[PDB]
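Q: What would this complex look like in 3D?
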Amino acid sequence: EAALNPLRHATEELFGDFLKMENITEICYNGNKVVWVLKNNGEWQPFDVRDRKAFSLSRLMHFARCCASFKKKTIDNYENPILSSNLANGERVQIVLSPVTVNDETISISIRIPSKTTYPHSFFEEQGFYNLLDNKEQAISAIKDGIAIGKNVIVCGGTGSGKTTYIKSIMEFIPKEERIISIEDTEEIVFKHHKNYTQLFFGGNITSADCLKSCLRMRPDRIILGELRSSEAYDFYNVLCSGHKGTLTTLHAGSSEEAFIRLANMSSSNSAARNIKFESLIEGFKDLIDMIVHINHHKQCDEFYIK
Amino acid sequence: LRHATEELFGDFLKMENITEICYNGNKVVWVLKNNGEWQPFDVRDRKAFNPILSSNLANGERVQIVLSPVTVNDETISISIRIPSKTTYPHSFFEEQGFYNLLDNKEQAISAIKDGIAIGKNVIVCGGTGSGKTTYIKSIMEFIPKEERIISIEDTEEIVFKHHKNYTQLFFGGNITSADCLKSCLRMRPDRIILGELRSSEAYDFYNVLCSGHKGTLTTLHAGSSEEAFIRLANMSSSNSAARNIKFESLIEGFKDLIDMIVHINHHKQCDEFYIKHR
Amino acid sequence: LSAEDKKFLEVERALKEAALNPLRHATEELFGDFLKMENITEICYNGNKVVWVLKNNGEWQPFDVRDRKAFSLSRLMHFARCCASFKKKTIDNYENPILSSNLANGERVQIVLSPVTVNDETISISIRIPSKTTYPHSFFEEQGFYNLLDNKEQAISAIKDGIAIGKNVIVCGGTGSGKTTYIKSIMEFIPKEERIISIEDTEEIVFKHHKNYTQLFFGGNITSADCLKSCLRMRPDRIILGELRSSEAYDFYNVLCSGHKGTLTTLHAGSSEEAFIRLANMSSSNSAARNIKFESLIEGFKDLIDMIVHINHHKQCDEFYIK
Amino acid sequence: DKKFLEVERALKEAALNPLRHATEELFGDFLKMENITEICYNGNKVVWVLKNNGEWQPFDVRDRKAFSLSRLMHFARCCASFKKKTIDNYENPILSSNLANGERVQIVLSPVTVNDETISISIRIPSKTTYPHSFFEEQGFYNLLDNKEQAISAIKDGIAIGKNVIVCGGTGSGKTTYIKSIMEFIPKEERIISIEDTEEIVFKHHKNYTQLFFGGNITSADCLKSCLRMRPDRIILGELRSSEAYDFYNVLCSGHKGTLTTLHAGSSEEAFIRLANMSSSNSAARNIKFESLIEGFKDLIDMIVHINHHKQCDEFYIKH
Amino acid sequence: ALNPLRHATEELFGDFLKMENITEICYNGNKVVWVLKNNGEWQPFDVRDRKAFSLSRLMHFARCCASFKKKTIDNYENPILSSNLANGERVQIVLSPVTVNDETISISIRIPSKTTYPHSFFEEQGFYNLLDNKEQAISAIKDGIAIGKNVIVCGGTGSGKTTYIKSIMEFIPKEERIISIEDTEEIVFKHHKNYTQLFFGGNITSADCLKSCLRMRPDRIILGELRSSEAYDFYNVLCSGHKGTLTTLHAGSSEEAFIRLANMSSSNSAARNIKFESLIEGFKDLIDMIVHINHHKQCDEFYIK
Amino acid sequence: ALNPLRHATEELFGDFLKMENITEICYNGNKVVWVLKNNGEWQPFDVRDRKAFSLSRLMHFARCCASFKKKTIDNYENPILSSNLANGERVQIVLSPVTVNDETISISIRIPSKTTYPHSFFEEQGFYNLLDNKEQAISAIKDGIAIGKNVIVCGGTGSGKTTYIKSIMEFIPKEERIISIEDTEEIVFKHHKNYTQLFFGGNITSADCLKSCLRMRPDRIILGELRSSEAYDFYNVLCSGHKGTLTTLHAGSSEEAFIRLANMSSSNSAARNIKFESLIEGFKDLIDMIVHINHHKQCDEFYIK
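A: Here is my prediction, written as structure tokens for the whole assembly.
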């Protein structure tokens, strides 16, 4: 709370108004008296804060420290000019100071609004999520019945494609008797259908891999890995092989094939992957991943790879 | 510890039919029975109730604990415990139950297991958590010549010796790693080696033993198929340092060459694959 | 506020200005006149009383500095240390005879001493004047930048429509071919609504057409890859990577794969094909590329890069790779 | 001599004798039995003896003080202290040492053993009875072979020429016993140098030789390196186990007369694999590819003799 | 400190250092001084009746050389010494116990080149006579090197590789900024003014000079000779769209050059993921011409992409 | 610090060290001294009635050997010792607990090459008799070495490797500047006047001599023997396009030499990035001929190309 309350204030002090805006996904400050908000409609909206003390080097830098200190980190204009932390409510914050930013009077701050809502899968249908698909009714059945059976599916796309929004909805299809264990860095997933579950969160000295490793020791029926980003991918790979009921996850890729390539790469980055050939890894995944849903830049499915 | 242990989990470490105890730092204790289902318990009216820690109770049973910032919040802690099975079904039970029914060579495999094991063949049983892996290998232990000198290596006494007199149990944990026990094991003149479960580095050591021309070995691991077992074995093997110059295809193939059979059990405690070597 | 932003900065600035004086002075002492000349791109000294200036017209102009104390072993050596000490480095005639640093304003400086240089009284210095003059694209057309091309008007439309659509283009060539000046110009064609994030070690790019952007700079313990990693966490719509040089290339590779809007960058190559080869080699140098086959990488790039503009030694495009 | 070996023969006995007693105290009778190869105690009032015939013989020592936690534990320390080691129920629960006469002893205490009153001890009684190779023939060692008379000629003539042979098999397959007998075929003029950690090899046919032994701070690798500097004609490396392998590999390429040795493997092919893997464990093998190593060996080893679970040859490989 | 040396130097090797067309002066601690003339013949000289060559006088010179480069030379931890004469020439001195005995001192001086044979000479000598396209190659070399093409000259040790690339340097536009990388000053700049020589050895590798070279804005790169890892870096340079490159290596043919290049490249760490056929093909594609010289200082092959 | 040794040495092995045509003297801590004659036969000698061979007298000699090379030998951390006698000959000493027991001391001493037989002698003795191309090789050796090819002579300890290379030195043009590197003066220069001998040992390693060697402008380099890291250095030299090189190492075949060369090369730090096949292939490439001598001082292999 002590490392907290002070942050809560600075936060509201600078981005109080913005964080209250609806249908937003990103608030950026480019150390230039302008706050930019990215709305789900995908349009960026600029705001002049010139006449605001809250956005003064001191007030800003205060907020900066309040963020670093909150996650037991530090930010300076020397060895630690770049910082990744979170706001009191979890929202991820990216802060950059000189000399990485252009100059002496420039401070960069970026915040991702984890879109808190949960649509019903049905909603996706009503909206024509699978309308680009030539097998609209096939996929739809595939998703519902596959996930229910316990297949390994992956949802991917670019930043702001709704990947997460989607996997949250398709969770309905998971037997409610299932013990789910999720692994996120920011509480986004919601358990509207299952009662037996446990949420795991990484960050700081705790890596996603740590969570994964502990997940395996908590006897879960389903594992949902919010997103793949680096070394964890390798671990994810082992999990797939260790004959586990079913798995759900997301990652940034531009297609079924890219996702594979991208997985192999993330996996290689891990130590224990020093002796594994590349085609080894790729083929490994291609072998275990049951389906991959890719979402285009218009929150629409443009790819439903199976088998 | 015995006190804190029996304080928090005194009424659960008794229960009925169980294998896992789990506290999600949310006023509720979940226990996994061998039937396969979870049982939830409300412990709201209980005062009894380096952020990641892997330990054991005072009785050996493994303890998995995680504190925040790893768990969700500041008022959330994560705890799990590895509740074993302590009942040695006679292999015939497995047959009576239809353990081999899914197999299209039901009677062939069943003879394979019994004769293979007696012969001293390298077998492996695998599946998902709570598939009865350990329950199974325990019962197939009869088929080992009673004159055999058995050496097991487990972190939690689960295996039982109902048919052998000449044996020694080895347990790891803490500063002592499975690999340690395995290396000692090799120095104890065994006839049969039972490695309760492969999980990490040891896999490499196991590999070498396989190669060191030994009588026969038994073990389990988590995989979803004969093929996955192999892949899985190679990965675990690589994690060890001494495996820095060994190529991947090298490892897998090495295993594919030394393992004689592999029994995979599905989520229904039923065999859906019985693999036999052909290379 | 400035009252504060001043007060806030006040001490710090002073301390910075202090540390730089030694250099700022040595710098102007020796290359004052030279650094002032217009349309230059390189100032070189070969430890022989003559200073060489390379003008954008591509011609080298020699200058006799025989009658100049500034160019004396001691004075020169002084400047040499001022540069090393400026980037917390050291330069000697032993374990550290070769030095890569920068001048007070960012320009990169290369200094070599004996025994790497020919002899005892020979000091080598080379300075790179950075792209400090923006040019709207029209200029390039007027000058016949696409004249050597057999599809002059085709490429031109490709660059304009391709960059606007969000394609991955790369501008390459030799050192001093106008790579950076060119890409800067083609930035107009990016939708002004886009949020751009650049990464360079010296502020050359200029944002004449966009208002929502952030500039990232590396050097010291902060590597380009660090900025790249952070860039990703800043929600950009476009990423302009000044120039690919080593490991970052791998990271760049992944970004291309991670389905990002579009990307701009420059590297040194002699052709579309050389660029590819070159990328793969730079990528392999990264640890996390230890399991990726060569032809894997190359083919990886060949598949993601949309177009490649190569510029010859006469600031003219002699190759425009598409598809 | 005496006045010169009295300061050492004094120390060595005021730490050895204690053990000699404890040893005979618990395993006196057992260590006296003939044709045995292993004595095991599983902390359960029963002593198990493994006879060469391969059968285990159990012995009730329930009514024996010698086998009491204190008496046993005493024996345990006598063993650790003998090789300047320590054994406890903490950081050092597992112990590998030797008896006064050399036999290797393996001891394990709680918490590695099952419980508080459980102490594990295993003694590898080294073999030691040389048959003239002919005995091996009379017994049908080469009977499972389809080229019985070919191999026999190969071993005899090959070893005499100075070929690189390896005899492998499981623990207690007679590996050593066999290589000792095939030593006949090595010209008696040859200068032989052996390297074992326990004197098993016997020189019945050669006079010019030197026995090297390792253990403690001295590794097989050290003996090997010294061996190379003692101008040998034949080298006999009792058994390969870990890094030495790599060193063994260099020797084979360092061109010299011939080499004999043994290792645990289940076949000609397993031998090779095995060799490569052991070689890798050596630092200096950090830049050598795996296939590199394997192929190197396959290139230098002239023949490999594998012995099955029944002390019979079931494989006779030969540069092909 | 310098002066002292200048005296000792002239005292012992005064006459020798004055001889023309020499490249090496060696003393083997045995009253004989040996001079290596460019014609390649060794000329021995009896200095028996010379006090300059007495253990003390010699040893004096030895220290004067060590002390000159702030080094030390003794018959203990520092018996081997590498230093230079006042004028720069490199001196190699060795004392007991490295030398055979107590009264033996070894000294070797390397004289840098400074003469360039005009290309014309080569022609007059029939350097291209064995070639079936004598006049074509000749035009190729002159016009190619002027346009900026990657050429390699190869042959056996002592085939005049270096001597030949030096001569072909004329054809390089005089306005070019050249940068060479040798470990021994052989190349001479008769035709260019804007240039800079880089030398390796010791903790500084050729690859280091190459890397610095690339940050010095050269127009032309002259790499004295390819031998090991640098080969890989060299490869990168070629792909990095560089105006033109000149270099030499030991090979017995256009084809061997290539193989040889690929192998020297593989020896570099960063070449761990590059296939072999990958490398060779890479080169075959970048190199424009290869000139092979036979054991009789004559061109027996003139490959042209 | 030398005189005490000279005494113990002559004390125990005085007579033995005097015998002619021997190559090894071994003592197996058993009152018997064994001598290996060049004819390859071992000759045993009973020294039971000799105090020189008493644990104390022996142990004394042992220490004199350790102390001579600033080393130590005991029956604890230093039971194994590699040193040399006053004249250079290498001595190997082993004490309990490495030797079989308390009263066992092992000692072995190599009799370096001293006598030089001219090449003709080797022919008269049928050195190339086991060769199917007796007259081809002989011509190969003579014309190759004269041309300046990289040859290697290998075999077992005491196979005459050194004696042989010494004899084949005739064929090197007498105008050549030869530079050898040994740790014991064995090589002789009966045909060349311009040469310098380099010797290593102590703080000076062969690699050091090798590095200086390269700065002494030699025409030919004779590397007494390859044994560990220098091998890498040797490799570079091979690559650095040098006139010709002669050397010996213990291998059992042409192929073994190669493998053996790559392993030794790997032991050097700078070879941390070079793949194994990279090195081997590097050698295979450069080495022109390898002469292997069997345990009967006879050539049983004459690899070429």
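A: To summarize the key features: Chain E is about 35% helix and 25% strand. The CA atoms of residues 196 and 263 of chain E lie 29 Å apart.
Q: Very helpful, thank you.
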